[PDB]
Amino acid sequence: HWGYGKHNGPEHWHKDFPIAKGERQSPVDIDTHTAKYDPSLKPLSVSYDQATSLRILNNGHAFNVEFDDSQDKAVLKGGPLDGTYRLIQFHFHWGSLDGQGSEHTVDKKKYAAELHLVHWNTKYGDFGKAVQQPDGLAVLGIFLKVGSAKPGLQKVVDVLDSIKTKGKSADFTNFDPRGLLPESLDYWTYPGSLTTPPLLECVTWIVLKEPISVSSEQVLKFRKLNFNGEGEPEELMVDNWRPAQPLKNRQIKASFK
Ligand SMILES: Cc1ccc(CNS(=O)(=O)c2ccc(S(N)(=O)=O)s2)cc1
Ligand SMILES: [Hg+2]
């Protein structure tokens, strides 16, 4: 139904998902001058050493790398979070051009892509229960800028050929998500939502200050994916990002000064 085209894109979402005009919708523009440094913010704790990746799949909206979340294998704690959040999957949002693609923007600046590492609050039992809670999810957002190649991203890039169309999946085990993290863990944080329908306002967003760089050819591979299924007219998977939403009654806190 929904998509990123002119006829079923972001501007149409509200008709099927009224929460699209809610009070804590994402993404937002991060105005660095009005973001408030919070000294009571703890450092993030990212434990991805036991992460067990399983599959990669093109879901017609993006490609996602899924992880085994049956136990506390790869978890996020600390920062503005209270509780353990399990890594379930990560995906990207990218543009048709290098100057667009990220969902969040910094001082109106757009990056070439944006990585979202999706985690759910374990106190809720399963992902489905987590999406019914205001503190159910924690998404780690990482900006991608074009520059030198990111070694840890190449494994992902090499498998894109086998999942070109919607519904295709491939085994993708033993992938280490630690190779996708910047050197610094400083971040901005604010309460928001999922950026694609159902747009549930259950997310504590943690956006890293430091972006990772990827080569021109790495992000180029992203753009060769298809939104369509095999046998259907080809539509390149590009610009699968949602425009910034009004911040409203929310303040962005920074873990750094
Ligand atoms: C019951 C149910 C609810 C929601 C989903 C969405 N699927 S999902 O949670 O993985 C995401 C959609 C958008 C994401 S973003 N771009 O904000 O990180 S994460 C599936 C199933
Ligand atoms: Hg919620």
Ligand SMILES: [Zn+2]
């Ligand atoms: Zn996303």
